[PDB]
Amino acid sequence: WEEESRRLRGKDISPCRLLFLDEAARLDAKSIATLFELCERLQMQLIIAAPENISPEKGTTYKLVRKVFKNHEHVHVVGLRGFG
Amino acid sequence: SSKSVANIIRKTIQREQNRIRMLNQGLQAVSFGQVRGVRLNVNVRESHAILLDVLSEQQEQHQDLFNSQRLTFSEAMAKLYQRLNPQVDMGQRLPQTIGEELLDYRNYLELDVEVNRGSDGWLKAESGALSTGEAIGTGMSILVMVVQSWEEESRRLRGKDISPCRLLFLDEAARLDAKSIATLFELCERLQMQLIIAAPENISPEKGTTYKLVRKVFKNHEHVHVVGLRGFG
Amino acid sequence: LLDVLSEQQEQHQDLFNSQRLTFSEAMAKLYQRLNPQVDMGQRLPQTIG
Amino acid sequence: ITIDDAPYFSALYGPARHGIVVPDLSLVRPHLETLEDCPEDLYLIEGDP
Amino acid sequence: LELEYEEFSEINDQLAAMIEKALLVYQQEQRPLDLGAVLRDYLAQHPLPRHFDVARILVDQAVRLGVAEADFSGLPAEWLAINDYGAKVQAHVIDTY
Amino acid sequence: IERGKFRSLTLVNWNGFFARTFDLDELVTTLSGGNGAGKSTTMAAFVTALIPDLTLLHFRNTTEAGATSGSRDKGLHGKLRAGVCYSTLDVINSRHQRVVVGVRLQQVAGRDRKVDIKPFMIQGLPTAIQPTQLLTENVGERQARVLPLNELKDRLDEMEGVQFKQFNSITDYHAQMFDLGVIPKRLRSASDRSKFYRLIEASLYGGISSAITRSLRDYLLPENSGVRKAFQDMEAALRENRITLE
Amino acid sequence: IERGKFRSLTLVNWNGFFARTFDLDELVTTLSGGNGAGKSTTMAAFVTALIPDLTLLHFRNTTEAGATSGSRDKGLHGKLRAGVCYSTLDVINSRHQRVVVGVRLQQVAGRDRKVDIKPFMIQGLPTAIQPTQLLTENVGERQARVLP
Amino acid sequence: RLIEASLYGGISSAITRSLRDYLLPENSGVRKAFQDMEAALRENRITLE
Amino acid sequence: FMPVKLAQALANSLFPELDSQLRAGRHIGIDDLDNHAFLMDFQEQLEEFYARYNVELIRAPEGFFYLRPRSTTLIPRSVLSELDMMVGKILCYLYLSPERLANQGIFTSQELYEELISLADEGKLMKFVNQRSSGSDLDKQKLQEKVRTTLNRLRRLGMVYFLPNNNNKFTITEAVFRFGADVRSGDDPREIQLRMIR
Amino acid sequence: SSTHIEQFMPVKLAQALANSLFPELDSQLRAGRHIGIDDLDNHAFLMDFQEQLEEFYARYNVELIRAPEGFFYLRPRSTTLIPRSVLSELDMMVGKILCYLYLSPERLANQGIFTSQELYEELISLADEGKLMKFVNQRSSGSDLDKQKLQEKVRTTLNRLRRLGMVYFLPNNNNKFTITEAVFRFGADVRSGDDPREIQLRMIRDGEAMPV
């Protein structure tokens, strides 16, 4: 697709690249390593989700906790870091 | 005739409602994400409730339709049912079949599945209105309902000292969080029911037996190396 | 089929003595012309021509 | 009841297998004189139905 | 408010490092390896609550070294005990490196 | 009291498994390994041994979990290997009788990917003999020889007190399994088989099953004959008369 | 040439989120938390913001994947709360231009669980402005309000 | 289609079935030449019918 | 090719009729035993069949089936009158609890007439007949006429079933809920229905 | 074998119903549109599966018919599952005039492009102008306001015929249009040189036409 649009596009613009994957937990460590190297070689952004932190040493990560609170719901978000 | 048929139907309905109510209690306080309980809601359809009451108490108003020997009993039931709720149409099917349908007690019952989600009350369980884990947990709940019902059904055809085996699966179990897995283990243990679960190593349940698999190439052929652990806890 | 349609009678009649190409085959594709077995619809696919 | 206990129970209850359970048996005493249409030997038992 | 943070522990990675270093000798000498004995000796070096994780990791490291030729004999292996409180293991001896 | 239990699962000459036996836990058994290791293959073996019906058996991929029939391939052929293959279960009843139930599998040769299946059952086996030993010969070669049903029948009949039963129809096989308390309901007819398979496969993939949800009353409520047969007998005189008139 | 990148995602008045902003990563961004935490909801908000075509949008469960169902409910309505809602993206152009795309979402009163969408775009916004603050008014003692 | 298939992951049934439509781009030069031929073939269809 | 079950479904003798009805906009309730059972059995394929027309086949939560056209509908569309919706909302209100004891499911034209007159605002009434009309006999007569007319329309929709005789007495089907209000946790149906009516 | 398309339906019929052209065509056909030779796609489609379509529609108690001129259309029976309607007499006047215009070799040089004014001029040349005006208004006596009203009614009816597929307007100019062969159905009362009464009887018997 990117190649196709080469003519119409202005010379100076390279379009954004981004994909998703839900339930990433279905993949094992070797598979995720393969996926990361593929996407980084192609300057491709990724957004992935899993119940447990499957990628501790790459990129950024957020942890979501839902609290019932005064007869409604509220989500608390905290970041995670590779080393401490 | 008349009243006695209504009484047997009522007692059958009552017994089914009570058994369901007993099954229902085993599923109270099951935690799956924001779901906190599951139920099987049983209700009686109106168009049949009024028919049952009429057959119970207004029989002198319709006896002409019941003792007319030119038509059989099931046909009489079908004709009475059409006399009530006249807007009902019949799809060119024999009145005999509609009669036998009225004779089957199950047709009088309406069944739903409900979940007690979060701050809200009891809601009908729709897949699109739940997260992934909640859906998996609800599915397991309904499955154990079915298994218990089937065991109660068949025991009248089995030996007095026989108790069938019970076993269920779960593929890609990594989709459930630790709390949900604890809930599921509690359920199966209380139900004496075995489980076989597959996960790409992400989960390590301490109780039970574990098998480690590794696929290799040996003498130019695919081969699976297997190791086992158990007894921890 | 592109070779069949491209190369015409007068020059390539000396080429046409091969068993695979002839003129009538363009009309033989009239059978294929009527309806190919397309499945999913978007835009507008119609026929061999 | 299962097939294994069926013969035992049938022997135990004997002719009374097809009696009726009625927890008082004094409430029938007034009704009883009216029974002109019944099997020649009717059995009644007291207990929680 | 502003986002907070939380950090991971590397204790299990360290554990994997000690085990792999301790196990490398078997391959280098091509010495036959028995999971029963190795697990029984190695669990003695840690307290009971951590045994399960140690067993898992040790098995993960050991299976990469060769195969057990007995697996093609059609004869199942026995469940060997490896500690008190009743933990068991099932595996044939590793012969083909 | 003392509910029965599944004791073990055995695979012979499947893709990646020449001869393997899994000792099942009383509560939970966990299969673990990297992608493509063969976990789903073991569950495929279990269910195919449980319900040997090629009309129902369809091992679609976990992704695309809910789609239509689609391809003509049922996904089973590729899990076998050339030659003869087996899948067997070992069970202990409340009576503590040891019964072994299983099927024999073979790739049917042809352009298409088809399979041949034959159920069987063994009773009275000593506790000292394992399935893998029954089904293989320890010939001089590095690897044993899997022995067909003829050799197996001859080998078993030689034993004292051991009975080998080989079935011609799935109905008989399910009848025997029910009589011994291996399944909770006796699969009268193909419809019953379909519902039982629905239950198993819905559990396997997970989620609120659409089919279970549609027909909820058909699954959760037993059918009662008492309300009916009285009226069939009372109706009989009229039915015969009407038929005679026609 | 320097390829463009997505800087961040913002949610306002979604089911469980009042006003939250996720800062994306250059290569990989991961969302973790127990079942029902809200990960798939974040995915849905992003996609929504990307392709507002209401005809298309259909958020099935992860189970039942690949089954063309025609479900009665597309699953978006329930992820929104009453009142006004937003979903916006901040992007850095290859030209090093900051552009803010997004949508205004709002439930429709009536028996049918329908939803309304209004796209919008912002250009030239100063680098010091955060979308979370731009979309809300500070009313009372640290008790902000959303504005249409 | 693209996005949704990525989100749920795996071999998307719809993508593979129409892979030509997805991957191969369209060419305007082809078209300009084909315009003429288009007219001619339309006319032939007319006649045939 | 074509899916086997879809071919089976549309081969059934009941399909042409149901097709005809559906395309007209008719709603299929639990009353129509055979049609309703047919739809229950073959929904998964009929939904796909009608999607080819850019028209949606919906099963309402109450149980009745109906078609909803998209903007791109291949079937020519038509739209109801204001008076139509008015009446519809009325009927939804009459699907009440005391109805059971009041009429045993069978109403008359006069019930609806008088309810309409009593509950509606004068202005909108006028708007329905003609803005220049003013509380006149003739106006009332025309209103009656229109009522009958619209009622018939509705009967075509399947909302209301006339009892089989020349007189105008009828029963209300469950599908009338399509007119109804949005329901929120704990809200009383009477109040919300009246709130929209106002 | 079981679960096989042939059990329930002929393969060619299923193949036709699965085509991407069918829904459009079906929709149109039901609405009363006639199909001529110019809309190739549709016409060709019709030709390819004629008998299957005929057999199909038969289920509805409607005949899928093919006129000699090569155009398809739907004719409902008395027991039809699909409603049936009749054209107005003004539509007939414009229809028979459009028919004579199609035949006229004198105007063939236009390459089929005609103008509303030419149609109107031909119509008034043949029919009784002042007596035809009665349908526009009971008091019409040749006043220009009434003449313009007649012209507007013509414009309107013509627009309706366009929807039936009997005439196609130009892509950019609406004052000009082109004819199609479907107009020959307006000559069904005279194509055979016989007694008009008997012809009319035959037509009403066949369900082609009703009186007023």
Ligand SMILES: Nc1ncnc2c1ncn2[C@@H]1O[C@H](COP(=O)(O)OP(=O)(O)OP(=O)(O)O)[C@@H](O)[C@H]1O
């Ligand atoms: N029908 C088949 N034909 C060919 N190869 C197959 C077939 N089924 C499975 N395989 C291959 O067998 C190996 C094991 O597959 P299997 O589905 O059992 O893996 P798994 O361990 O369950 O994986 P995961 O849990 O990641 O799904 C894989 O290489 C798979 O490609």
Ligand SMILES: Nc1ncnc2c1ncn2[C@@H]1O[C@H](COP(=O)(O)OP(=O)(O)OP(=O)(O)O)[C@@H](O)[C@H]1O
């Ligand atoms: N349409 C909806 N209507 C009502 N509640 C909904 C809807 N969609 C999601 N929810 C609820 O919102 C919460 C968040 O669900 P969501 O799927 O986003 O969570 P999650 O963390 O991604 O979970 P999982 O990993 O199990 O998929 C859950 O309680 C879910 O039940």
Ligand SMILES: [Mg+2]
């Ligand atoms: Mg797998």
Ligand SMILES: [Mg+2]
């Ligand atoms: Mg989720």
